[PDB]
Design a protein around this motif. Sequence first.
Motif, PDB file in Angstrom:
ATOM      1  N   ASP A   1       0.866  -1.167   0.000  1.00  0.00           N
ATOM      2  CA  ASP A   1       0.000   0.000   0.000  1.00  0.00           C
ATOM      3  C   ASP A   1       0.912   1.228   0.000  1.00  0.00           C
ATOM      4  O   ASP A   1       0.857   2.065   0.905  1.00  0.00           O
ATOM      5  N   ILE A   2       1.757   1.314  -1.027  1.00  0.00           N
ATOM      6  CA  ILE A   2       2.700   2.422  -1.178  1.00  0.00           C
ATOM      7  C   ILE A   2       2.554   3.120  -2.541  1.00  0.00           C
ATOM      8  O   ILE A   2       2.143   2.530  -3.545  1.00  0.00           O
ATOM      9  N   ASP A   3       2.873   4.402  -2.560  1.00  0.00           N
ATOM     10  CA  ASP A   3       2.784   5.162  -3.787  1.00  0.00           C
ATOM     11  C   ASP A   3       3.555   4.407  -4.869  1.00  0.00           C
ATOM     12  O   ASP A   3       4.662   3.913  -4.634  1.00  0.00           O
ATOM     13  N   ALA A   4       2.947   4.316  -6.046  1.00  0.00           N
ATOM     14  CA  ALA A   4       3.561   3.646  -7.190  1.00  0.00           C
ATOM     15  C   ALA A   4       4.994   4.164  -7.432  1.00  0.00           C
ATOM     16  O   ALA A   4       5.860   3.413  -7.879  1.00  0.00           O
ATOM     17  N   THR A   5       5.246   5.433  -7.098  1.00  0.00           N
ATOM     18  CA  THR A   5       6.570   6.037  -7.282  1.00  0.00           C
ATOM     19  C   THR A   5       7.623   5.678  -6.214  1.00  0.00           C
ATOM     20  O   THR A   5       8.789   6.040  -6.328  1.00  0.00           O
ATOM     21  N   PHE A   6       7.230   4.944  -5.190  1.00  0.00           N
ATOM     22  CA  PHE A   6       8.181   4.567  -4.139  1.00  0.00           C
ATOM     23  C   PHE A   6       8.472   3.069  -4.157  1.00  0.00           C
ATOM     24  O   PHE A   6       7.629   2.262  -4.541  1.00  0.00           O
ATOM     25  N   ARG A   7       9.682   2.706  -3.756  1.00  0.00           N
ATOM     26  CA  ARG A   7      10.063   1.304  -3.685  1.00  0.00           C
ATOM     27  C   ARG A   7      10.926   1.141  -2.449  1.00  0.00           C
ATOM     28  O   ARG A   7      11.780   1.975  -2.180  1.00  0.00           O
ATOM     29  N   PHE A   8      10.728   0.057  -1.711  1.00  0.00           N
ATOM     30  CA  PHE A   8      11.552  -0.170  -0.541  1.00  0.00           C
ATOM     31  C   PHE A   8      12.998  -0.366  -0.975  1.00  0.00           C
ATOM     32  O   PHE A   8      13.304  -1.210  -1.814  1.00  0.00           O
ATOM     33  N   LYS A   9      13.894   0.409  -0.385  1.00  0.00           N
ATOM     34  CA  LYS A   9      15.308   0.309  -0.694  1.00  0.00           C
ATOM     35  C   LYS A   9      16.027  -0.535   0.381  1.00  0.00           C
ATOM     36  O   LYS A   9      16.404  -0.055   1.455  1.00  0.00           O
ATOM     37  N   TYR A  10      16.206  -1.811   0.075  1.00  0.00           N
ATOM     38  CA  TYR A  10      16.847  -2.754   0.990  1.00  0.00           C
ATOM     39  C   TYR A  10      18.345  -2.893   0.754  1.00  0.00           C
ATOM     40  O   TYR A  10      18.757  -3.205  -0.337  1.00  0.00           O
TER      41      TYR A  10
END
Lengths: 392, 389, 392
Positions: A51-60
């Motif tokens: 449930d995150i903005d399409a423009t964001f991605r988790f940076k692991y």
Amino acid sequence: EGPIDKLKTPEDVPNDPLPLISDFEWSTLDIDDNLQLDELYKLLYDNYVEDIDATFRFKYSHEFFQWALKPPGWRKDWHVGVRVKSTGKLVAFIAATPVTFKLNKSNKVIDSVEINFLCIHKKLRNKRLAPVLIKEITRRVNKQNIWQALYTGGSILPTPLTTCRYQHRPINWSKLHDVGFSHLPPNQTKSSMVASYTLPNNPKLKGLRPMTGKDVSTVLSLLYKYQERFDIVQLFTEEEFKHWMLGHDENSDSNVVKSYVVEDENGIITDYFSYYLLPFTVLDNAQHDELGIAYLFYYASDSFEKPNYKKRLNELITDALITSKKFGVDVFNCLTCQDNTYFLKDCKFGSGDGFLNYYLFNYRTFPMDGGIDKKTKEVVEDQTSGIGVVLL
Amino acid sequence: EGPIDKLKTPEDVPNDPLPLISDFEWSTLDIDDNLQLDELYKLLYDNYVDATFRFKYSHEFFQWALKPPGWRKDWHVGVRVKSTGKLVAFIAATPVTFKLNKSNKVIDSVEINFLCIHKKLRNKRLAPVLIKEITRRVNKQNIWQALYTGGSILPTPLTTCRYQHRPINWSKLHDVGFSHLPPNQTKSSMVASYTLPNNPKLKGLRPMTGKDVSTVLSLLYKYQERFDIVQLFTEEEFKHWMLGHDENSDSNVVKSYVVEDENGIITDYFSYYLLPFTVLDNAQHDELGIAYLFYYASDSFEKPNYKKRLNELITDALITSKKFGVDVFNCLTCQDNTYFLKDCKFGSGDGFLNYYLFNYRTFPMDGGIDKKTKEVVEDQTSGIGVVLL
Amino acid sequence: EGPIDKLKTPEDVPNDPLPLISDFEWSTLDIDDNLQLDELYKLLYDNYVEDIDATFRFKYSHEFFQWALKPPGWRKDWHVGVRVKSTGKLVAFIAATPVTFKLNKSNKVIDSVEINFLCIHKKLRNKRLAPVLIKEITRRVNKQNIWQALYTGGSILPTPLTTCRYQHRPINWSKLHDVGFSHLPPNQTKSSMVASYTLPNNPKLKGLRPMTGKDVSTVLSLLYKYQERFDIVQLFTEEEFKHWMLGHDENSDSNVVKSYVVEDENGIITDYFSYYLLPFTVLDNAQHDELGIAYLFYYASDSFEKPNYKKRLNELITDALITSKKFGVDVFNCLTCQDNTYFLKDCKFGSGDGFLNYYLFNYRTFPMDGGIDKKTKEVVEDQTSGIGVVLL
């Protein structure tokens, strides 16, 4: 309060993985093999955008994975992937990490597991794979004689322990606004907003310093006395607390978990707090590529019995906010769990659209307060939530 | 209460279909091949059934009914006569998750339906063979319980519910022989006694959308705690069953509505599906629009205005169906349906439905009717909380 | 104050051992079979090394085991081992021994059990067996209608009765230095240290002699009167007291427990003390193989109501220290429990890094003084600790 299933032995548990449609196959992942860890990172990056903005991605980062997946007792067998047979490509994953919980009301201690990183490729969303992933990881842990598991998410499954709501405290509003995270309220300007969120550059509490290995037993005792007020909490061995509070590697300052203690004029630790860092990669913005995010972890204070308790807690979190400024944090997040609703208002945390549901599989528990009104779902100030655990 | 069979593994299950009479052969259907789907439609139309009525199945209906998330082609089992290759029997299994509330048991199972046998093969008693084979196929996928429903009287049913009908267009139901004119009545009185408003009454009533899924699902979960057996869904699943196979096109099969109050909080919801009858030998009509009550839930179950609220909900359901050519609105005596049958004007039908949970013993359940008179028992909660299409 | 669980009957207790990961199986040990006792010794020697130096190992003799595990009323059924099915090798153990406690403030007597010798093979530290061992030994004693148990150790759990600290009194400093137990202080020499710890060769108190079976009732009465000052104490039958003070075998002087009494001209016993011997095997020292260790046990004095109490207690312990010299003792240890803080300073006991936590499962009790400051963990002189029991 208690287990639900009739109770069996590891013996009564199927020895082999559940069957899957012929196009796929189970593939246990070995995260110590950087090529496989790379595969996992790619699967998550593209498909774990819950449930995150399409423009964001988790940076692991590699360091984040060591911390999140390798606490003492972790098992490779519990890092379960699914591969498409045709090409061998990783298309789904689920993990179980060991954890010990305690239900304070009934005084029950339960060795369990936390189920997370449940990821399914976006093209396979209609294959009903989640329930299969959960059954299989559950089978694997039942084989290890563990019969309760904690699972959390925005998904709505039956009987949640309760539901908490996300909160956000802008640290660098201008940037949050430039990338679309924060909006400019009706009769406000970018200037008023920024001004309203400015914070000191230096922590205010005397005796505040970073936690070290030598503080582990003392902090642990402080947290144990303190968390008696929540319904469900976590217990740690000293080796586990050390890992979760200071990082996977004992001889290198962690860039993932930040833990601080406050020792009074006589050298005695009276308070402590911790938070972890998990940035978002930002897509399609001409100036910014990353958004620094912090998440409130575990904390505890002396003052819970005294009258300056609320003020003291708000002072603690304010110093947490202040310290995060030196680690690139743009927004400091937390949920309405623990005693968090005692500081949300004064510390300027706004309610977000996201909610978190907690499920304790194979276990009945009395209802728990989630820090919000059951119908309005709005924050209820200065209330103790029954949730005393924080899941990454 | 619990499984019946000694419990084995997929390994202990025969790897191949059990041989049929030499005249026939097993033939797995591929409904994504329109030619085979056409074959299924013809087999059903002719052999799956009053004499003058036939289930009218559209392509959209089939997508909805047979392709929910996780559906398997391998579970669409047909039988072909070797001589000409003609399809003469069929049986299906679709994934479903049930929960037995009393014992708090959750069971991943399957619903067995569309069991069809050509009228000329009714003496070969192929049904048991169809059930054994589909059962073998799912046991292989490690599923060990299944739900099957129908008028057939098999060994030990969960319970038995009765059909109910609520005329929407009495004149047409009369024209086609569905409804009969009571002793001292006229077509005019009947029609007048069933008139309904043209617009729904509840404020904040609107069609459900994708965004309501989690909220509605939570509302149904809280609500259905009152029944003995219910269904659990993943959000993808619930979305499929309440809104249609295709997310970007309003469904003509399932109609789902929610009621949100002055504060935008969903307080009630109801759904129903459309399945018309093709009408044969009537000089005026070719089709009879039919709606079937699906799943519903309300805030008020703990309040004192519960019964009145439920009846208000169903009444709006009845009113909305008028815009979709519905001639009769049906439902069984399951769930809390008996709380609205009387005030909403639902009459008892001759049909009854039996529920069977193969390989599982359960405590007796209420069916919404008296055990001996088989008559509707008003305002009673039935143990049946699942609806099967 | 009182039990915690709702209270059930042996009947409500599961009749069979808890399930185990399929690789293992429960195996009741029979310590009267020397082969099995040998197994236990080996398991301990290799894996029961928690909170001690890597170069030290507990040296358990057959005599020590008779004394520790076979007091009157001991049960073989409470010597619970775990064996790996593949080879039948012993990989874990836990024991329960009968013991009676009394809570002086509430005047409650409770027949219970002491849970000890909890040992797990180093390679299974990640199978999370401890909780399972406890649950299973607890089930066996609940079956015998005992519902409380005492457990002690360095492990930290929520709500201990209290915490005490270890103390050491060098007897042979040079050897303790050679093997790395004791360190040479900043501006000190090996010569100064040795000189600072010298002791007479003969006990000073008149009428001091070794206790015998005859003295049991008198000594027991003296201890009972005396121990009224602590919060929790132990009660013995004359038979139990005889065993614990004099040894398993009535007709042979014990090499494990040393008990002494002080009587006046008319045979009136006015004081008494006891201590037990438990050496360490020393590894990798080109000079020494064993390190003699003594542990202060139970003691009592007439003088507790008199003004010479403190001085008298110190005289008592000083004679204990002197007597240990004839039994090869290199360091004399004790905890800060009982009235020990009254003699630590004058007798030259230094605080160690070790601490001991006490837990009374299934029973809430009022807080107790552990002989150390609740905040600094430092010794608090001449104070009475609520702990009046000593666990081997």
